[PDB]
Design a protein around this ligand. Structure first.
Ligand SMILES: NC[C@H]1CC[C@H](C(=O)N[C@@H](Cc2ccccc2)c2cc(-c3ccc4[nH]nc(O)c4c3)ccn2)CC1
Length: 238
């Protein structure tokens, strides 16, 4: 996160750090708890990941330093990538991780609500992007979870900022015209959380952008409301 501040412990209890074990243990992406055995993240996080065996999901973490070999984690049973996904820039950048065990809900870990179909018309004015990603283009993964309040931008406005790309309605953008606050490397897969009627909703999944917090280059996110039926399809399978 560029231009953000340290989160308070338990502030984003749906936020997870997805670690890889191959070749060495490192943070790979962010993600969101959406169900007791379900993590919602970005499909691009899995480039070259040949097996769910190498993945470790850590919930209830504020600081990366809390993670040692003795730290409990959730194993991944299945990686479910949208079947239309080719690359982040073309959309369908959404994936589900089915966990091997159930997340026990509490004050350190709980799910975020998905947007409602009727809420495609609501205007979100209180949106926050979180993660352990870089604070500048060339940096390192941050210890403490960072947060930044970002205004949502219309698809028309986002399309002007991305000449040569096709900003679809399955994408949602967020940023300040002058830059300064944005998601950066290592934040991808994480949430874009919006509070409306005292309830937080998973509005976006950090996906892509041209650089980090640049003027007239808003962050591009998977528009979660457009995938509620695909999520229910995969999570509510008989
Ligand atoms: N302004 C809007 C934003 C939107 C989000 C974008 C983003 O985050 N893209 C991802 C794409 C990806 C590539 C490979 C794996 C997973 C995701 C990314 C992540 C990293 C990364 C990840 C883990 C790491 N661990 N240690 C590291 O140093 C480190 C660096 C580096 C480079 N790109 C940046 C622009």
């Amino acid at each position: 996160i560029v231009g953000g501040t340290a989160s308070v412990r338990g502030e984003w209890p749906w936020q997870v750090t997805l670690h890889t074990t191959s070749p060495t243990q490192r943070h790979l992406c962010g993600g969101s708890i959406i169900g007791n055995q379900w993590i919602l993240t970005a499909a691009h996080c899995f480039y070259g990941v040949e097996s769910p065996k190498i993945l470790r999901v850590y919930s209830g973490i504020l600081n990366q330093s809390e993670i040692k070999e003795d730290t409990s984690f959730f194993g991944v049973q299945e990686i479910i990538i949208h079947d239309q996904y080719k690359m982040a820039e073309s959309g369908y950048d959404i994936a589900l991780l089915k966990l091997e065990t159930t997340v026990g809900y509490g004050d350190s870990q709980r799910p975020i609500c998905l947007p409602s179909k009727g809420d495609r018309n609501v205007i979100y004015t209180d949106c926050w992007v979180t993660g352990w990603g870089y604070r500048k283009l060339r940096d390192k993964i941050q210890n403490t979870l960072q947060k930044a309040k970002i205004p949502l931008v219309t698809n028309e406005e986002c399309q002007k900022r991305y000449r040569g790309h096709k900003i679809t309605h399955k994408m949602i953008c967020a940023g300040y015209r002058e830059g300064g606050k944005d998601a950066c490397k290592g934040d991808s897969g994480g949430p874009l959380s919006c509070k409306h009627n005292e309830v937080w909703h998973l509005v976006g999944i950090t996906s892509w952008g041209e650089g980090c917090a640049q003027r007239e280059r808003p962050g591009v996110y998977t528009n979660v409301v457009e995938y509620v039926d695909w999520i229910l399809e995969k999570t509510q399978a008989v």
